[PDB]
Design a protein around this nucleic acid. Structure first.
Lengths: 62, 224, 195, 95, 72, 129
RNA sequence: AGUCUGGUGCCAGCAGCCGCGGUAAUUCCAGCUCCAAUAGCGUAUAUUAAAAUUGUUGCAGUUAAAACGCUCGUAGUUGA
RNA sequence: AGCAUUUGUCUAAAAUACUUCCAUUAAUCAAGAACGAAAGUUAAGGGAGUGAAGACGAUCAGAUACCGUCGUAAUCUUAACCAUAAACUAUGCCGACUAGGUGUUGGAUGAAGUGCUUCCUUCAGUACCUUAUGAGAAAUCAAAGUCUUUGGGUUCUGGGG
């Protein structure tokens, strides 16, 4: 804690997780990054978003 | 179903005078009655019913002047997935019978694990609370604590047993010849067993302990 | 007052024999030149009272099991069992009595009372795997493994065993509501042995 | 020759509930045993009668293991109902 | 989750499946030497019993609690 | 020769605690061993200890609290730089919330957290659990 | 992931290893279905992990491999 | 390694004891050195028994072997050498800490049999027996323990057949 490189790189990493939306509103520390899961990353794929929005009827159609 | 506990302590659990397995564990009481486990880990009302799995079946043989005399040893792994593991072992001269015997043994074996945090309070005990090592024959197996999102690994058997214990994150290690599976299973169970036996700073606090079930229900035990 | 102590003295309780037992040397008074070990007995009377306190703290006497593998102490335990309703075991002990749930002869007790750890050793050993405390009338050559209360006594003589059970019985009766402590107890006293 | 466990077990049951019917004579014992126990063979009945008679002979001469008679139990319960210098020295040593 | 028993004699932890450790209930006296209602409880490990040291330990424990006078 | 005084003392203490006697009389005595017991007492493992005078070297009687899981020594007292400390504790300790790794650093003998707070390496001395 | 369908018959042959084949082959030769990875997948050789099987961390030496025949002793290493 | 007749001589040795002296001299040790059973070599004695070799009689299917009878070299001493053995507590050596009892050899301390003798306590040796929620693959091991809860010090050795 309070180590200069670590707090800078940590704030930068979490900020990037916020930019990606990989971490959202309710998650905001390095232990939630450990909490991150492979489905959460997969959900970021454009085909998932297209299917979710309902522009197409399925993941394959998307 | 239909029930009848021969032991008095069993009858108390059957009635529900003893509410949970934690109290009998606290007073360290030996169990020869599977019905006690059956009552506590019932399919509904229990939050986490036990899941069983026959982990290793091996033929072993006496051999005579005449015939083989081939017996079947059976290892089964049982767990709630949240705190209570069991490794059960039975050798019998018929497979289905061996499988049943091992499951009963597993219930008798059923032990509570302790878990901890890797560091800061997350409100979920998730990994082993310290490094613990268990030995059987050649093989000595060590579970070592891991941070969150850092899932359990090992042999299939180790992976299953840790999953049965409800250990989410662990580092595993092993020393010796890993091949001997029953010894490997037993050594994992020995290591796993030590988790809720290890003295720790949190237990420095001098604290009262309750009077026995054998005195709390003494009249009820005299009664029936 | 003194009289209970004096009777204990008059009975041959104080005679320890060959080998002190390292652990028991705090209850030995002195090694006699004759090759016998003297026992303190003052501590024994108070300790016997503690044993009575633990026994009274068991709320039902039937969950207190007595044991003797000594012929003459078999009669003594049976007398003890008659006065206060502890179940006695005499003759051949069976290991499954505490360990084998489905056995016909089974006991699920809360306490064990032992007449001699050297004779009654099997029961004591099994009792520790069955988590029962074990109080024990113990002698110089007798082992002290797996007993919680040790009461020093010459276990060889009939009179000594009888005296201990008689004194014990009176103390439990006194702790119980049966008879006031000031009053002497006299219900068929000194009738505790046979051939 | 000897007598098997079934014969001995039957003989042990006898005396225990039935000593007040038993006698020294084998032919009368053969009648008593037939009267008391519904034994399926003559050979078996004769052997049980014989060993019960043998136990009868053993009885009165002494107590016999593995059986109980309530009159003997009653009889047993009924039947049962400072110091000098050499004694002194240990007590004096204590003080 | 719960806290396992700790030995009175050795101040150390007793496992769930230890199956040898015992709880010794000691009855308090009345002034006339009669059994009081209340009872003092102590936890004795199977290990101390296995060593054979339980009587000695009990004596020190009773001495601390003022239930025996001679200590040893 | 006498070999490492600290090590045999700590092994004796370890044996005493393993046995459950809970007091022991240490036959050697030295300034560093006394400080090490004081450090253990600082971290709540030891109660009171009495160092009794003898001209050749004192003796120590330590009260043990039923509380030591292990006490041991790193032999000899190997040198170690600040960032290497993190690997050392990771290797040794049974838990990240308990067990203590002790160094000697220019300001005396102290644990790994203290040394880190300082910012100084040292020689690594011993440890207890 | 198949006691799938035919052929060969200790032969032909295959198969890191165990093995399969002496007539009803779940391993050979075809055919069929199924399975793994995928525009890549086989094969050899070298190399790291595997190996706390070279061991500072971190090995072993009663009986499995391994205490110099024994003692002294300079360098060496260790130093109330 | 090995050492048993008697006495003498020349010698070394350890423990006990010490309000004796010194003041860290130490520990284990590549290199090097000393000693090192039985056999073998070489020379002088000596050379009885025993007896590698060798010779016969058997035994037996054959038997050049076991077995019988004989029997050189050797065994023995001195003088040189030789430098290996299952030269095995198959356990390197020193260090501390752990658990009891039965013994036992050498001393010192106390008490009572009749100065001596015994017994008690205690040291340095030394075995055994039981116990190891100690260890180990178990046998077993009070060391092979106190070693994944792994670092008391150090020498040597091994890496499937």
């Amino acid at each position: 804690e309070k180590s200069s490189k670590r707090i800078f790189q940590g704030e930068a990493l979490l900020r990037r997780m916020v930019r990606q939306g990989l971490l959202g509103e309710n998650e905001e520390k390095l232990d939630y990054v450990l909490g991150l899961t492979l489905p959460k990353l997969l959900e970021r794929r454009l085909q998932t978003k297209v299917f979710k929005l309902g522009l197409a009827k399925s993941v394959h159609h998307a | 179903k239909n029930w009848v506990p021969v032991t008095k302590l069993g009858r108390l659990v059957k009635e529900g005078k003893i509410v949970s397995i934690e109290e009998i564990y606290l007073h360290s009481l030996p169990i020869k009655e599977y019905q006690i486990i059956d009552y506590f880990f019932q399919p509904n009302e229990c939050s986490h019913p036990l899941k069983d799995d026959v982990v290793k079946i091996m033929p072993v043989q006496k051999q005579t002047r005449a015939g083989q005399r081939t017996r079947f040893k059976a290892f089964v792994a049982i767990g709630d997935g949240n705190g209570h593991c069991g490794l059960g072992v039975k050798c019998a001269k018929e497979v289905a019978t061996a499988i049943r015997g091992a499951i009963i043994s597993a219930k008798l074996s059923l032990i509570p694990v302790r878990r901890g945090y890797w560091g800061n309070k997350i409100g979920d005990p998730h990994t082993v609370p310290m490094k613990v090592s268990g030995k059987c024959g050649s093989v000595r197996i060590r579970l070592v604590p891991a941070p969150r999102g850092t899932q359990i690994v090992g042999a299939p058997t180790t992976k299953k047993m840790l999953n049965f214990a409800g250990i989410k994150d662990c580092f595993s290690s092993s020393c010796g010849k890993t091949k001997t599976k029953g010894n490997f299973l037993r050594a994992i169970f020995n290591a796993l067993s030590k988790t809720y036996g290890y003295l720790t700073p949190d237990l420095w606090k001098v604290t009262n302990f309750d009077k026995s079930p054998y005195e709390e229900w003494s009249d009820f035990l005299e009664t029936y | 007052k003194e009289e209970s102590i004096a009777k204990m003295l008059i009975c041959k309780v104080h005679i320890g024999t060959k080998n002190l037992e390292n652990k028991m040397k705090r209850y030995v008074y002195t090694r006699a030149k004759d090759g016998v070990h003297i026992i303190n007995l003052a501590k024994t009377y108070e300790k016997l009272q503690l044993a009575a306190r633990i026994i009274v703290a068991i709320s039902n006497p039937a969950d207190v099991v007595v044991v003797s593998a000594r012929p003459f102490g078999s009669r003594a335990v049976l007398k003890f069992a008659q006065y206060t309703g502890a179940q006695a075991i005499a003759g051949r002990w069976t290991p499954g009595m505490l360990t084998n749930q489905i056995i016909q002869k089974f006991t699920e007790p809360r306490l064990l009372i032992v007449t001699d750890p050297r004779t009654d050793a099997q029961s004591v050993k099994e009792s520790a795997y069955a988590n029962i405390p074990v109080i024990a009338l113990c002698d110089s050559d007798s082992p002290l493994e797996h007993v919680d209360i040790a009461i020093p006594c010459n276990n060889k003589g009939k009179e000594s065993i009888a005296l201990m059970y008689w004194l014990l019985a009176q103390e439990v009766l006194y702790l119980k509501g049966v008879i006031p402590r000031s009053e002497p107890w006299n219900v068929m006293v000194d009738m505790f042995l046979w051939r | 020759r000897v007598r098997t466990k079934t014969i001995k077990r039957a003989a042990r049951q006898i005396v225990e509930k039935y000593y007040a019917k038993l006698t020294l004579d084998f032919q009368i014992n053969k009648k008593i045993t037939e009267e008391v126990a519904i034994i399926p063979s003559k050979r078996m009945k004769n052997k049980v009668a014989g060993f019960v008679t043998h136990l009868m002979k053993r009885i009165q001469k002494g107590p016999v293991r593995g059986i109980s008679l309530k009159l003997q139990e009653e009889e047993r319960e009924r039947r049962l109902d400072y110091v000098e210098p050499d004694t002194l020295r240990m007590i004096k040593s204590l003080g | 989750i719960y806290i396992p028993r700790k030995c009175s004699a050795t101040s150390r932890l007793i496992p769930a499946k230890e199956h040898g450790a015992v709880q010794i209930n000691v009855g308090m006296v009345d002034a006339n030497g009669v059994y009081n209602g209340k009872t003092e409880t102590f936890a004795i490990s199977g290990h101390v019993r296995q060593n054979g040291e339980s009587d000695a330990c009990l004596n020190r424990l009773m001495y601390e609690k003022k239930l025996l006078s001679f200590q040893n | 020769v006498r070999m490492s005084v600290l090590a045999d003392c700590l092994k004796t203490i370890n044996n005493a605690e393993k046995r459950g006697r809970r007091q022991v009389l240490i036959r050697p005595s030295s300034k560093v061993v006394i400080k090490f017991l004081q450090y253990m007492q600082k971290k709540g493992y030891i109660g009171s200890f009495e160092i009794v005078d003898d001209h050749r070297s004192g003796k120590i009687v330590v009260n043990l609290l039923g509380r030591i899981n292990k006490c041991a020594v790193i032999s000899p007292r190997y040198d170690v730089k600040l960032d290497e400390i993190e690997k050392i504790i990771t290797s040794i300790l049974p838990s990240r919330l308990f067990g203590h790794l002790i160094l000697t650093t220019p300001y005396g003998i102290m644990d790994h957290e203290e040394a880190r707070r300082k910012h100084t390496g040292g020689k690594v001395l011993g440890f207890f659990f």
